[PDB]
Design a protein around this motif. Structure first.
Motif, mmCIF file in Angstrom:
data_model
loop_
_atom_site.group_PDB
_atom_site.id
_atom_site.type_symbol
_atom_site.label_atom_id
_atom_site.label_comp_id
_atom_site.label_asym_id
_atom_site.label_seq_id
_atom_site.Cartn_x
_atom_site.Cartn_y
_atom_site.Cartn_z
ATOM 1 N N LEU A 161 -6.811 -2.611 -3.243
ATOM 2 C CA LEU A 161 -8.246 -2.751 -3.455
ATOM 3 C C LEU A 161 -8.588 -4.235 -3.535
ATOM 4 N N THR A 162 -9.878 -4.531 -3.676
ATOM 5 C CA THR A 162 -10.338 -5.914 -3.799
ATOM 6 C C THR A 162 -10.159 -6.354 -5.245
ATOM 7 N N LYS A 163 -9.127 -7.152 -5.495
ATOM 8 C CA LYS A 163 -8.843 -7.637 -6.835
ATOM 9 C C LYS A 163 -9.932 -8.594 -7.303
ATOM 10 N N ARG A 164 -10.165 -8.614 -8.613
ATOM 11 C CA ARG A 164 -11.161 -9.498 -9.200
ATOM 12 C C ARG A 164 -10.719 -9.937 -10.588
ATOM 13 N N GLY A 205 0.775 -1.222 0.000
ATOM 14 C CA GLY A 205 0.000 0.000 0.000
ATOM 15 C C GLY A 205 0.811 1.279 0.000
ATOM 16 N N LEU A 206 2.099 1.216 -0.323
ATOM 17 C CA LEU A 206 2.946 2.391 -0.444
ATOM 18 C C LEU A 206 3.078 2.790 -1.911
ATOM 19 N N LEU A 252 1.750 5.995 5.979
ATOM 20 C CA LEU A 252 2.022 6.134 4.560
ATOM 21 C C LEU A 252 0.862 5.591 3.746
ATOM 22 N N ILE A 253 0.582 6.259 2.629
ATOM 23 C CA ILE A 253 -0.532 5.934 1.756
ATOM 24 C C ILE A 253 -0.030 5.897 0.322
ATOM 25 N N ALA A 254 -0.918 5.481 -0.570
ATOM 26 C CA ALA A 254 -0.648 5.503 -2.000
ATOM 27 C C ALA A 254 -1.606 6.472 -2.725
ATOM 28 N N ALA A 299 13.248 -2.729 -3.997
ATOM 29 C CA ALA A 299 12.910 -2.754 -5.413
ATOM 30 C C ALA A 299 14.137 -2.525 -6.282
ATOM 31 N N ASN A 317 -13.425 -3.733 -15.228
ATOM 32 C CA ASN A 317 -13.441 -3.557 -13.778
ATOM 33 C C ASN A 317 -12.329 -4.405 -13.177
ATOM 34 N N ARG A 318 -11.203 -3.770 -12.877
ATOM 35 C CA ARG A 318 -10.073 -4.434 -12.244
ATOM 36 C C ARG A 318 -10.255 -4.632 -10.750
ATOM 37 N N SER A 319 -11.237 -3.980 -10.149
ATOM 38 C CA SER A 319 -11.479 -4.086 -8.727
ATOM 39 C C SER A 319 -12.978 -4.103 -8.490
ATOM 40 N N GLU A 320 -13.369 -4.673 -7.351
ATOM 41 C CA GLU A 320 -14.781 -4.690 -6.984
ATOM 42 C C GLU A 320 -15.301 -3.294 -6.705
ATOM 43 N N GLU A 321 -14.436 -2.405 -6.215
ATOM 44 C CA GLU A 321 -14.855 -1.050 -5.882
ATOM 45 C C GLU A 321 -15.352 -0.294 -7.111
ATOM 46 N N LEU A 370 -10.735 -10.409 -14.372
ATOM 47 C CA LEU A 370 -11.224 -9.730 -15.558
ATOM 48 C C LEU A 370 -11.790 -10.751 -16.543
ATOM 49 N N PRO A 371 -12.860 -10.403 -17.254
ATOM 50 C CA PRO A 371 -13.489 -11.366 -18.164
ATOM 51 C C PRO A 371 -12.629 -11.625 -19.393
ATOM 52 N N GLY A 375 1.335 0.501 -4.409
ATOM 53 C CA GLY A 375 0.033 0.937 -4.861
ATOM 54 C C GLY A 375 -1.049 0.687 -3.825
ATOM 55 N N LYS A 376 -2.158 1.394 -3.998
ATOM 56 C CA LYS A 376 -3.299 1.232 -3.111
ATOM 57 C C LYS A 376 -3.849 -0.186 -3.220
ATOM 58 N N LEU A 419 8.222 -3.256 -4.219
ATOM 59 C CA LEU A 419 7.869 -4.238 -5.239
ATOM 60 C C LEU A 419 6.381 -4.244 -5.563
#
Ligand SMILES: [Mg+2]
Ligand SMILES: [Mg+2]
Ligand SMILES: [Mg+2]
Ligand SMILES: [Mg+2]
Ligand SMILES: [Mg+2]
Ligand SMILES: [Mg+2]
Ligand SMILES: [Mg+2]
Ligand SMILES: [Mg+2]
Ligand SMILES: [Mg+2]
Ligand SMILES: [Mg+2]
Ligand SMILES: [Mg+2]
Ligand SMILES: [Mg+2]
Lengths: 95, 147, 207
Positions: free
Chosen positions: A14-17, A3-4, B145-147, C185, C102-106, A19-20, A11-12, A8
């Motif tokens: 989120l709930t991944k899902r 979440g930084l 810290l955030i993104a 990284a 839609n890559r995320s549920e949000e 893709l079709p 990024g934020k 590596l």
RNA sequence: GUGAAGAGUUUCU
RNA sequence: UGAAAGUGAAUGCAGGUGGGAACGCCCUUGUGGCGUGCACCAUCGACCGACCCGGAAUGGAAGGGUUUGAGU
RNA sequence: UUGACCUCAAAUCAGGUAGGACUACGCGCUGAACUUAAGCAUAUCAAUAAGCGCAGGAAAAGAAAAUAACCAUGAUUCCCUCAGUAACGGCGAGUGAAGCGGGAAAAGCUCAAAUUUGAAAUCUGGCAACAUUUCUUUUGUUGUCCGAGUUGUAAUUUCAAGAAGCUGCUUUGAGUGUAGACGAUCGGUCUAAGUUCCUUGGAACAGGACGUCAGAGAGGGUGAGAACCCCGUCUUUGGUCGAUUGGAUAUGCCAUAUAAAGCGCUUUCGAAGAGUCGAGUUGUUUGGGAAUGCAGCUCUAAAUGGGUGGUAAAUUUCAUCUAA
């Protein structure tokens, strides 16, 4: 996935899902009908003159020479390696 | 306006202020800024040193959005919060501490210039300088810290 | 020649620029024309809203991904989950974007909620007047041209005003974490190439 | 393009 | 600030010294003495970046420097 | 010998069609030099002037072989911004874009690759009849015959998919005249008011006195500065015509409406554009830098292939798009 904004898996979070399926990405797959047609065409049409020359170098175990010629004929090395593998399968198919 | 211009004052003065000897000819030392290395050198070297030559690396296809990171110092951190939030927490003793999300105020890194009051605060930022983090922790607050 | 104080001059006026000068004397005229076109269009499509409902999407890049804005159209998955066929969507003012996913549920849930709110406020007139059908409405009398932004505005994301400071936050070292994560990284490739040399060149030890 | 000799799996006169 | 990867501004009353506007107080009629000291200039430091150091896989923390920057 | 087919001719054959002009704006080709660099050749002027081809009311562009590297975006065009920036440049003079963001406007689709094969289901022309009209000037329908077409015209599909099968679901396009109004408008007017008196003057439209209208005191005319002399100006309806299912109970009724779409589980599938892509090289061009686009010539592809990811190369990943 800390979440930084650095590291590596940045990024934020989120709930991944999933893709079709995009059918456009199916391109490049080999359909059974197309493979059948190409085998018939390869029977009717022969081999290109450079293809025969490359296969001859493959049959004489001149592996570098075949690679140099196929790359020189087709342009890139990546296309050459694919072509040499294809012509190698042909040679072994006849054996 | 034209009525107050110096041109109006020079009517009747033959040379219009440009001299009888040297005159107001067309370009007598060349056009634009041509000649900085030769006959304009004494000007370029005095008022624009560093003009000629190359320094540093090229960067092809620079895109500035991934480099975006405006900064805010510690002395402005409490100014980012509404007046009502300041009155509720600043100087008081509360179980909860205010959250200052610096990114929604348009900043990517928190820098350490200035001082903080002695109230706990949670600073949400993408980046923070070392000295900024030390001063936030001394005030009883934290950096998350955030993104 | 150059002898005055200030910046060295830079003016890009060596072509026949006066040939292609664009003036704006028609600026109020264009503004009036565009407003009149909107008024003409609104009266023609009434009582449909003048603007179609749009999805909410996050702008790309780190400079704008904290914001929310209108997008082009709803995804096929979003329309599916809101119970709207893609062929029907256009007939009732719902744009379809076959390119966005839609890559995320949000993202999916946010736009599915926009469609559900649109459908609940939507009055579909029957194709044949006075013979209501499935999916239509029977109280079309109070139909008027209304703004979609009045019903479904684009809302920016809110904040936590305040919260407790936990012991975990107090022990967190933000600056050191940023330095370490950047270093990790940076030298991942050397570490991976090292791991090959750590386990492959040792294979000769077996035999 | 199509055929014949010669030269230390080939292309040169 | 650095070519860049990057890093990023309070020991202290946001410092000391000299001159100094304005103000206040003492003389005793002088071009006075005393106390704060705005602006500005000169000057000794501190702080940030670069650079040069030693310097107890990755990070560069404390310690430094005749230096350097269109900084604080 | 004839006939069929193929290929190729001819006719003042039946019916069509092109050319020339306009060039402000638009799409291309070709293409300078003056000029600036204080000289000058690369550069600049300029991918400009001149020259040539070709369009429309706009043109071109356009539904990604696009961005990015995000929590991602989502055809094209235009504006603001990006930005006089990244970059190019005898790194001299000079030159110089793009992604994001805000806004105007928004709209999406068609083919080729498939066996209809229990039925070429497709199309043009001639002839005849029947309709139709901005219109005897327009535009079709049906029948019939002949041609086209299997060297492939239709139908389902176009990758966002989709098709074939397993299983469960609801059901729709056209004439008459009203009111509400609406495009050309009108027998075009209900649309208001001093041409009284005195003085000057050739003339009152001037000055004075006394009045008037004003939703009209814009402008013009009339023997000199006229709201009230004239045209108008301002304000506001009633006669037509045509688009008139565009909207309404669009009523009153035509009788469209019997077989075509929507989702829904399971499968096996899923044809996807070649002298093209790509490589080299030469020329040109670009801000595009060991090639940005274009073009010649040489070589010349592939099937999870191929393109792009702005430093040449080899390899391995990842992302994104899906060319000809
Ligand atoms: Mg003179
Ligand atoms: Mg002289
Ligand atoms: Mg010259
Ligand atoms: Mg000259
Ligand atoms: Mg000359
Ligand atoms: Mg021309
Ligand atoms: Mg025309
Ligand atoms: Mg067009
Ligand atoms: Mg497409
Ligand atoms: Mg140019
Ligand atoms: Mg294609
Ligand atoms: Mg040319």
């Amino acid at each position: 996935a800390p979440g930084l904004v650095v590291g590596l898996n940045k990024g934020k979070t989120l709930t991944k899902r999933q893709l079709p399926e995009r059918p456009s990405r199916r391109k490049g797959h080999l359909s059974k009908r197309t493979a059948f047609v190409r085998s018939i065409v390869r029977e009717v049409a022969g081999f290109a003159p450079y293809e025969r020359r490359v296969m001859e170098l493959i049959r004489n175990s001149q592996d570098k020479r075949a690679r140099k010629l196929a790359k020189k004929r087709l342009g890139t090395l990546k296309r050459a390696k694919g072509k040499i593998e294809e012509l190698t399968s042909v040679i072994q198919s006849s054996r | 306006p034209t009525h107050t211009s110096k041109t109006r004052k020079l009517r009747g003065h033959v040379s219009a202020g440009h001299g009888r000897i040297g005159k107001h000819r067309k370009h007598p030392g060349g056009r634009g800024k041509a000649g900085g290395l030769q006959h304009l050198r004494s000007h370029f070297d005095k008022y624009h040193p560093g003009y000629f030559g190359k320094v540093g690396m090229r960067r092809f296809h620079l895109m500035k959005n991934p480099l975006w990171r405006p900064t805010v110092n510690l002395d402005r951190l409490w100014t980012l919060v509404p007046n009502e939030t300041r009155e509720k927490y600043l100087g008081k003793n509360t179980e909860v501490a205010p959250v200052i999300n610096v990114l929604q105020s348009g900043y990517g890194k928190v820098l350490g210039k200035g001082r903080l009051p002695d109230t706990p605060v949670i600073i949400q930022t993408r980046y923070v300088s070392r000295r900024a983090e030390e001063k936030i922790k001394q005030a009883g607050g934290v950096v998350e810290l955030i993104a | 020649a150059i002898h005055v104080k200030g910046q060295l001059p830079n003016a890009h006026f060596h072509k026949d620029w006066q040939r292609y000068v664009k003036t704006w004397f028609n600026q109020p005229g264009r503004k009036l024309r565009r407003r009149q076109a909107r008024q003409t269009k609104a009266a023609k499509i009434a009582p449909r809203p003048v603007e179609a409902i749009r999805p909410a999407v996050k702008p790309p890049t780190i400079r704008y991904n904290m914001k929310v804005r209108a997008g082009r159209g709803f995804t096929l998955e979003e329309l599916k989950a809101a119970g709207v066929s893609r062929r029907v969507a256009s007939t009732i003012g719902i744009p379809v974007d076959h390119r966005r996913r839609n890559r995320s549920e949000e993202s999916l849930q946010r736009n599915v909620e926009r469609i559900k709110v649109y459908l609940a406020h939507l009055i579909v007139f029957p194709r044949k007047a006075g013979q209501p059908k499935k999916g239509d409405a029977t109280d079309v009398s109070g139909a008027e041209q209304t703004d979609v932004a009045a019903v479904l505005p684009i809302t920016q994301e809110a904040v936590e005003e305040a919260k407790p400071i936990t012991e975990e936050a107090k022990n967190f070292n933000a600056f050191s974490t940023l330095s370490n994560e950047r270093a990790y990284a940076r030298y991942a490739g050397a570490r991976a190439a090292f791991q090959k040399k750590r386990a492959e060149e040792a294979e000769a030890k077996k035999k």
